[PDB]
Amino acid sequence: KNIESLFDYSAGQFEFIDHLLTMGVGVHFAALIFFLVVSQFVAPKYRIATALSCIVMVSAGLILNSQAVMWTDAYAYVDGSYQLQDLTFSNGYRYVNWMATIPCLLLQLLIVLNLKGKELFSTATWLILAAWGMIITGYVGQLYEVDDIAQLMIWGAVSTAFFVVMNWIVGTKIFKNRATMLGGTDSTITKVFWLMMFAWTLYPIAYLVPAFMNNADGVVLRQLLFTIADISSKVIYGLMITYIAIQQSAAAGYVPAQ
């Protein structure tokens, strides 16, 4: 049901798509080590936040590594072009990985925002439930990205309603709680929010490639878009989240931080 099956791929497009997926694997398992090492320099209050990045890094690296092997098993160079052989490559694997990493990415945001008790459990439920609705409706629409572009749009519209509400919650919790953050992190968190608004919006852009660029280069463009957003929403995001966690741990008196 995905457009990846409709086209033959020259050796250049195929190996380029293969090098984007495997490169992601290394970048994510490389950042994992980093997020693993610096956790000792994070006070216990925020130490959970860096651990979630470690979880996020592994969750993403396993699907990318799976996507790569699934990419090289499904196609075979025949008569000058890589042609589909078996059907085992699908973007759906991504959406099942967003269901897991998105909650972890949202959790670590609220942890550095210094929410606790009622609000943490409450804000986390509406956000996770809001995201899960976004990812699921979007997963139903991409099943029609080959057959019914109309349905892709309709489900894309619904999915965007969830996305809009989610950010309003995130943005509202941020701008109303940054005055409680230490070490000047009240300024850095605002940038992280703008880092979110940009990196997260690249996903719907790739979601619509079947609609405005239906060809083998649109598939290369999609993975390139997924790759850019994936490194920003998870790696750079986790790094930015780590720094805020460390910076505040230092201002709170934690000696390792500091």
Ligand X SMILES: *C\C=C(C)/C=C/C=C(C)/C=C/C1=C(C)CCCC1(C)C
Ligand Y SMILES: CCCCCCCC/C=C\CCCCCCCC(=O)O
> Any contact of residue 225 with ligand Y (CB under 6 A)?
no
Structure-token match 């196609």, residue found: 75
> Any contact of residue 101 with ligand X (CB under 6 A)?
yes
Q: Which two tokens stand for residue 1?
A: 């049901």
DSSP for 146-207, written as a single string: TT-HHHHHHHHHHHHHHHHHHHHHHHHHHHTTGGG-STTHHHHHHHHHHHHHHHHHHHHHHH
* One of 77, 121, 126, 194 touching ligand OLC (CB under 6 A): 126
Q: Which two tokens stand for residue 198?
A: 């940009």
Q: Which two tokens stand for residue 257?
A: 């931080």
CB atoms within 10 A of CB 121: 11
Integer angstrom CA distances of residue 73 from 4, 84, 98, 223? 14, 9, 24, 17
* One of 146, 149, 165, 239 touching ligand Y (CB under 6 A): 149
Residues in region 107-136 near ligand Y by CB under 6 A: 107, 111, 121, 124-125, 128-129, 132-133, 136
Site string for ligand Y, 197-216 (x = CB under 6 A): -------x--xx--------
> Any contact of residue 180 with ligand OLC (CB under 6 A)?
no
Phi, psi dihedral angles at 7 (to 5 degrees) = -135, 150
Give least dist CB 64 to ligand X, A: 11
> Any contact of residue 187 with ligand OLC (CB under 6 A)?
no
| Separation of alpha carbons 210 and 192, rounded Å | 30
Q: Closest Cα partner for 63 from 102, 90, 103, 32? A: 90
| Separation of alpha carbons 20 and 13, rounded Å | 11
Residues in region 159-178 near ligand OLC by CB under 6 A: 160-161, 164-165, 167-169, 171-172, 175-176
Give least dist CB 98 to Cl ion, A: 7
Residues forming contacts to ligand OLC in the complex (CB under 6 A) are: 122-123, 126, 157, 160-161, 164-165, 167-169, 171-172, 175-176
Interface ranges with ligand X (CB under 6 A): 98, 101-102, 105, 134-135, 138, 156, 159-160, 163, 200, 203-204, 207, 230, 233-234
Q: Which spans of this chain sit near ligand Y (rule: CB under 6 A)? A: 18, 22, 25-26, 29-30, 33, 45, 48, 65, 68-69, 72, 107, 111, 121, 124-125, 128-129, 132-133, 136-137, 140, 149-151, 153-158, 160, 204, 207-208
